[PDB]
RNA sequence: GGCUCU
RNA sequence: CUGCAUGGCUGUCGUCAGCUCGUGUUGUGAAAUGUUGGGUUAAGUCCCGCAACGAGCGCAACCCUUAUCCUUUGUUGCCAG
RNA sequence: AAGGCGGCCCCCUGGACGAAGACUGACGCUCAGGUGCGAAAGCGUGGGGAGCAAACAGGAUUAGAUACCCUGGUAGUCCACGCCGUAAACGAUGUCGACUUGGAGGUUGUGCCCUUGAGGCGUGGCUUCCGGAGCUAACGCGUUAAGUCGACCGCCUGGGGA
RNA sequence: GGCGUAAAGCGCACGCAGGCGGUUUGUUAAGUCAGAUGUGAAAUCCCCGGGCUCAACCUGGGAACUGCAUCUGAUACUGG
């Protein structure tokens with residue numbers, strides 16, 4: 001019960017919001033429900049797709065969803081086949097005309113949500129958690145990260161006594177505000193319970 | 209290469225008092241004058257000449273030599289001798305693990321080089337000038353400690369030491385690594401960790417200069433050979 | 434190549450303000466199938482790191498042992514701190530008759546026929562030190578011949 | 590100044 | 596229902612200045628050194644010294660606001676002339 | 677010898693050490709049982725009795741206070757002769773002998789050098805501290821060994837119960 | 839195998855019996871060593887073999903029974 005969320009603390013400095021629109025109070029919470037429902041839908045559909053960051057922006061009563069994903073071939077299919085299928089249901093949910101853009105994720109090993117979900121998928125298919133944490137750290141420091149910290153929590157190996165473990169390689173300054181800390185969190189629903197995964201990635205300092 | 213009355217003129221026969229001496233120096237002590245032991249130069253000369261012969265052996269095959277003295281009296285003399293025979297020196301404090309943890313000290317050799325590159329040659333002007341002074345006293349410290357070996361790159365092949373107890377740490381690190389040791393063993397020291405024992409005074413500047421000049425000679429002659 | 438055996442792992446502790454800190458120790462021994470033997474003792478928060486540190490220290494600090502064909506040369510004794518250790522050369526194919534840690538150190542030592550006995554404390558660290566000291570100070574007929582200044586045949 | 594137990 | 600099967604979130608000691616690692620070395624070993632010493636600081640802050648050399652999380656700064664000034668832009672704000 | 681021994685003087689008396697010589701010629705070491713000595717407290721008889729002080733009494737303190745604190749105070753402490761025969765009676769290290777690097781002292785002899793000053797060089801006895809090898813579980817001991825060996829004795833064998 | 843601190847040096851000492859005993863020469867030959875002889879029942883154990891279809895088992899021969907006694911020598915050590 002101690003640490004602030006590094007994204008929410010970095011949101012004015014080096015991190016951008018995942019929703020960049022403007023509205024008055026009349027249509028604010030309605031837009032925010034619509035954004036929640038579409039991020040819900042896209043996560044369930046693109047679960048096998050290595051989606052990282054769903055960015056939502058709505059100008060002129062027209063939603064524009066920018067999906068960042070490690071592979072766009074399975075999300076698109078043919079050019080506007082599955083994307084157009086998801087676009088017409090996004091416009092059904094949002095009630096406005098939609099537009100879907102796709103940003104490819106270079107170096108998917110340097111994206112916190114993908115790493116945590118890969119670990120979660122491994123724990124769900126019953127691998128050793130320490131091997132998963134090692135390979136995530138070795139792969140990120142190989143790919144060029146200045147520092148990674150992972151942390152799992154609870155019911156490890158089906159052990160009735162829940163504990164947390166964490167690995168660290170490189171420097172991860174959380175208190176440094178200009179640090180490009182990619183932080184995200186996943187959950188593994190094992191047969192013995194819920195295993196929580198947190199991941200911090202330090203890319204370097206933005207000199208604004 | 210140095211005669212006995214040369215050693216006697218420089219002051220090699222002097223030593224320390226009789227309440228500080230090591231009983232292992234009995235085969236090296238001639239007598240005791242004014243409550244001070246006297247070093248047998250009869251056994252000093254042929255042992256120093258055996259050491260210079262082995263120095264000529266290693267510098268024949270281009271071995272690396274490290275001069276070790278941080279007595280704050282022979283610091284400049286051990287520097288001028290190692291830059292005379294372009295070998296490597298330690299004039300200020302022997303860092304603990306300079307040899308055994310070489311792979312760690314190497315990362316400070318590299319840091320000293322990049323700081324010298326950036327500031328003198330690299331002209332790494334225009335930073336926060338207070339950090340430029342923290343860089344300055346950093347580079348001063350690294351040159352003061354690791355400047356004599358910054359071009360060595362690997363482990364040396366022989367170590368020449370001025371005092372076996374003021375520098376007993378370098379003896380142990382060399383003794384572990386199988387590196388031969390040539391040392392000026394005074395009366396208050398231990399001649400066991402030294403592979404080639406040279407009796408003689410340690411604080412006498414004339415004797416330090418005699419030893420170092422005789423080594424920089426038989427090294428340059430062994431280098432050329 | 435160099436065969437490597439861990440003898441024993443052990444979990445140790447260290448009590449601090451927060452509570453108990455656990456750690457793991459590893460005792461490994463290496464050898465070339467001949468007289469070159471060496472042991473290591475590593476310690477870390479985790480068991481594979483401890484075996485790796487132990488194998489690292491064991492690959493260095495090797496010691497050379499003047500073996501006979503496949504056995505020792507004379508009945509030798511070794512002590513370290515709790516562990517008087519007796520070992521004896523034996524006939525061909527009688528095996529390694531030895532207890533615990535001494536079996537592992539002699540197996541990587543390349544010995545194959547001993548009659549050993551560990552008296553006293555059988556702590557594996559001290560008994561493996563006592564075996565290393567016994568094999569190290571075991572001397573050959575050549576070394577005793579050069580020492581006494583006689584031939585081997587004059588020694589028999 | 591002394592000032593028990595858990 | 597079980598917070599004594601769990602995640603997540605929060606309190607707390609405590610914004611206290613501390614907690615550790617790698618290699619090296621010492622010790623049979625648990626462990627130690629580093630991290631100790633002299634000063635100094637809000638601070639394991641800095642300097643010097645030293646079997647340690649280095650590094651990391653933290654102590655700091657980078658953030659916001661206030662406090663003075665300048666330029667730009669002057670309405671729905673302003674009024675010296 | 678240990679326990680232990682503290683003004684000064686005398687009487688009786690034991691032991692140690694040193695220097696040179698002279699003499700005897702293995703006469704020696706250890707020791708079960710045995711014998712003797714053996715702090716304080718205690719006992720007995722006879723004295724003595726200032727101070728201190730178990731006990732005890734009173735005052736306080738405290739929840740209580742058969743205690744610590746206070747005011748008093750008896751055996752006792754003292755002497756002679758006997759008994760007891762124990763102590764963390766400890767160096768918690770049996771006695772005797774031999775060998776093995778050093779340093780700084782203390783004390784007590786003694787030889788020599790011109791004591792050219794209270795100095796200089798030695799050689800014996802006893803003693804303290806540090807410490808090397810080596811030993812030891814470690815702590816530490818370390819030429820006065822807990823090192824390397826020999827001779828003899830005493831003793832130990834899980835914690836209680838005991 | 840131990841006894842500074844883990845159990846364990848009598849509180850100290852003298853000292854009988856007892857255990858041990860410097861060095862040299864001579865003698866003895868007790869101890870000791872070597873050899874021989876007698877004995878140490880057989881079985882058993884062990885070795886080399888043989889026989890029951892093998893083995894268990896049975897069995898031939900041998901070694902062994904580390905001992906004791908006598909005699910003959912040896913004389914370094916110990917003793918006298």
Ligand SMILES: [Mg+2]
Pocket residue numbers: 002003004
């Ligand atoms: Mg907080």
Ligand SMILES: [Mg+2]
Pocket residue numbers: 553554
């Ligand atoms: Mg035991």
Ligand SMILES: [Mg+2]
Pocket residue numbers: 594
């Ligand atoms: Mg209590």
Ligand SMILES: [Mg+2]
Pocket residue numbers: 594
């Ligand atoms: Mg009660």
Ligand SMILES: [Mg+2]
Pocket residue numbers: 598
């Ligand atoms: Mg809880």
Ligand SMILES: [Mg+2]
Pocket residue numbers: none
């Ligand atoms: Mg919880």
Ligand SMILES: [Mg+2]
Pocket residue numbers: 597599
């Ligand atoms: Mg329960």
Ligand SMILES: [Mg+2]
Pocket residue numbers: none
């Ligand atoms: Mg370390």
Ligand SMILES: [Mg+2]
Pocket residue numbers: none
């Ligand atoms: Mg070690």
Ligand SMILES: [Mg+2]
Pocket residue numbers: 630
């Ligand atoms: Mg600390």
Ligand SMILES: [Mg+2]
Pocket residue numbers: 630
């Ligand atoms: Mg520490």
Ligand SMILES: [Mg+2]
Pocket residue numbers: none
């Ligand atoms: Mg400090």
Ligand SMILES: [Mg+2]
Pocket residue numbers: 639654
């Ligand atoms: Mg800091």
Ligand SMILES: [Mg+2]
Pocket residue numbers: 175655
């Ligand atoms: Mg801060």
Ligand SMILES: [Mg+2]
Pocket residue numbers: none
């Ligand atoms: Mg006579």
Ligand SMILES: [Mg+2]
Pocket residue numbers: none
């Ligand atoms: Mg006696």
